[PDB]
Amino acid sequence: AAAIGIDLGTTYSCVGVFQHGKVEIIANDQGNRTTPSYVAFTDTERLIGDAAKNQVALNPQNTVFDAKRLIGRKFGDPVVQSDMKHWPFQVINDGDKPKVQVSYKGETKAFYPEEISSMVLTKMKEIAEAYLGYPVTNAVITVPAYFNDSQRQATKDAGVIAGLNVLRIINEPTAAAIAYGLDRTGKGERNVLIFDLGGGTFDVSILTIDDGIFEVKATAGDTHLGGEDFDNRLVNHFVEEFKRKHKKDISQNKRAVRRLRTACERAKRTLSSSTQASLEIDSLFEGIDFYTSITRARFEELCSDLFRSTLEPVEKALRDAKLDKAQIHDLVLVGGSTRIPKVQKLLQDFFNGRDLNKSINPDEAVAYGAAVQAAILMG
Ligand SMILES: Nc1ncnc2c1ncn2[C@@H]1O[C@H](COP(=O)(O)OP(=O)(O)O)[C@@H](O)[C@H]1O
Ligand SMILES: [Mg+2]
Ligand code: NA
Ligand code: NA
Ligand code: NA
């Protein structure tokens, strides 16, 4: 009866299980290997993952996400107060602690972030239970290296609320290191850089691994830099193309903007594999179709600054670790936004044409490690 590895992500989560000497990442019911960290509440049902993200445009007050920015923090924490302005769902104080308040089945109900995160974790558990054919009771769960003790504690609580014994809370970069087998080089000291660009957050972590033992030498990043911000540049481009091509400002209508956001996301992903993408939105604003397109290089210009800003934290982590570019043994790409060729290319130029570790899908890499370490901990 195997234990599972879970990446409980800001924007996407992923579950894996080690079976027969190899890691298996479990696709969700729509066949996706990651699941958005979205919970939605309606008059009749509670929805998690893809089904929850797919109705966001029609249910903004009761469709919850970004729980991981609240988890284990105080309500009066300035990070939470600032984040609250950007969400359409309500956050309330409940003696010092934030809760998310929504309508659900014709009533007002309020939930701690770890309750929200436990619903996400429950989805990940169920998907693994149908894949294996038995109940799952054990898991490793990942968290970012910067998480304080309370953020860890609340995430581990999220696990126990989902009916899991959490075997260990481990750092995301460590799990990605373990993915790539970097704890199983023996008597020998190796320097690893984890470059983690996801949906909401960019984290750079430098690790030193000695006899398979892990030391964190530096972390740096930007908790508000990720895939969504690139989506948002695409939105603003297409908003303005709409104001030229049909003479109307859609920026005020939340539904339009949020459906456009979704189409931009899909178009972004297509641009990692093709040099151009089409955007086809039936009845975007006041009956009017929006059909258009954009090149990769045009996308790259729109994001120029954001992509180039991923380098300042790499440099910073290297100074804080007191190493140079050259003394990194392994460069590991993690996070779904590292699929973007310009991001990969900038990093390569900066590390003097070094070949990059991407054999493991970067959006799965954390869960990959998590699953290996889960199985190790079961014995
Ligand atoms: N092929 C792709 N090209 C560009 N971005 C991608 C691709 N696939 C996924 N992404 C982006 O990666 C982000 C998801 O990152 P992921 O690492 O899976 O979750 P998290 O960052 O929350 O841990 C989203 O912004 C998503 O749009
Ligand atoms: Mg991640
Ligand atoms: Na993730
Ligand atoms: Na990230
Ligand atoms: Na992220």
In what helix (H) or strand (E) does residue 36 lie, and over which residues does it extend? Answer: strand 35-36
Ligand 1 contact via 221 beta carbon (within 6 Å): no
- Looking at the DSSP bridge assignments, the partners of residue 36 are 12
User: Strand, helix or coil at 177?
Assistant: helix
Q: Helix H segments across 246-361?
A: 254-270, 296-302, 304-309, 311-321, 341-350
Residue 21 and residue 140 in one domain: yes
Residue 190: closest CA among 172, 226, 215, 227: 215
In what helix (H) or strand (E) does residue 7 lie, and over which residues does it extend? Answer: strand 4-7
Residue 4 and residue 38 in one domain: yes
Residues 300, 230: Cα–Cα separation, whole Å: 9
Residues 48, 35: Cα–Cα separation, whole Å: 9
Distance 335 CA to ligand 1 centre (A): 6
Residue 249 and residue 293 in one domain: yes
The pair of structure tokens assigned to 90 is 């309500």
Residues 325, 94: Cα–Cα separation, whole Å: 47
The answer to whether the CB of 283 falls within 8 A of the CB of 351 is: no
Distance 223 CA to ligand 5 centre (A): 8
Residue 104 and residue 129 in one domain: no
The pair of structure tokens assigned to 116 is 């929200």
Residue 41 and residue 54 in one domain: yes
User: Strand, helix or coil at 140?
Assistant: strand
Q: Which residues does the annotation place in the binding site for ATP?
A: 9-12, 68, 199-201, 265-272, 336-339
Nearest CA to ligand 1 atom 22: 11
Residues 63, 157: Cα–Cα separation, whole Å: 22
Residues 298, 264: Cα–Cα separation, whole Å: 13
Q: How many other C-beta atoms lie within 10 A of the C-beta of residue 320?
A: 14
Q: Which residue has the tokens 């989506």?
A: 231
Task: Kindly provide the b/e burial profile for residues 109-136, where b requires at least 16 CB atoms within 10 angstroms of the residue's own CB.
Answer: eebbbbbbbbbbbbbbbbbbeebbeeeb
Query: 356: which DSSP letter?
Result: P
Distance 319 CA to ligand 4 centre (A): 21
The answer to whether the CB of 36 falls within 8 A of the CB of 11 is: yes
Q: What residue type is 346 in one-letter code? A: L
What are the CA-CA distances from residue 27 to residues 16, 34, 55, 190, 364 (Å)? 9, 7, 21, 33, 11
Q: What is the CATH number of the domain that holds 216?
A: 3.30.420.40
Q: Which residues does the annotation place in the binding site?
A: 9-12, 68, 199-201, 265-272, 336-339
Q: Which residues contact 206 (CB under 8 A, 6 or more apart)?
A: 191, 192, 193, 194, 216, 217, 218, 219, 317, 318, 320, 321, 323, 328
Ligand 1 contact via 111 beta carbon (within 6 Å): no
Catalytic residue among 114, 157, 172, 222: 172
Experimental approach taken: X-ray
In what helix (H) or strand (E) does residue 165 lie, and over which residues does it extend? Answer: strand 165-171
The answer to whether the CB of 366 falls within 8 A of the CB of 178 is: no
Residue 17: closest CA among 135, 139, 134, 120: 139
Residue 196 and residue 95 in one domain: no
Ligand 1 contact via 337 beta carbon (within 6 Å): yes
The answer to whether the CB of 21 falls within 8 A of the CB of 2 is: no
Active site residue 211: no
Q: What is the CA radius of gyration of the chain?
A: 21
Residue 21 and residue 32 in one domain: yes
Residue 58 and residue 168 in one domain: yes
Residue 34 and residue 136 in one domain: yes
Query: 247: which DSSP letter?
Result: S
Residue 1 and residue 108 in one domain: no
Q: What is the CATH number of the domain that holds 244?
A: 3.90.640.10
Q: Which residues contact 76 (CB under 8 A, 6 or more apart)?
A: 96
Residue 202: closest CA among 4, 42, 362, 378: 362
Task: Give residue 104's domain range.
Answer: 65-119
> How do beta strands 46-48 and 39-41 pair?
antiparallel
Residue 377: closest CA among 230, 235, 178: 178
Active site residue 68: yes
Residue 165 and residue 261 in one domain: no
Residue 334: closest CA among 305, 365, 356: 365
Nearest CA to ligand 1 atom 21: 198
Residue 215 and residue 317 in one domain: yes
The pair of structure tokens assigned to 209 is 């691994």
Domain count, the chain: 4
User: Strand, helix or coil at 124?
Assistant: helix
Residue 111: closest CA among 103, 124, 97, 101: 101
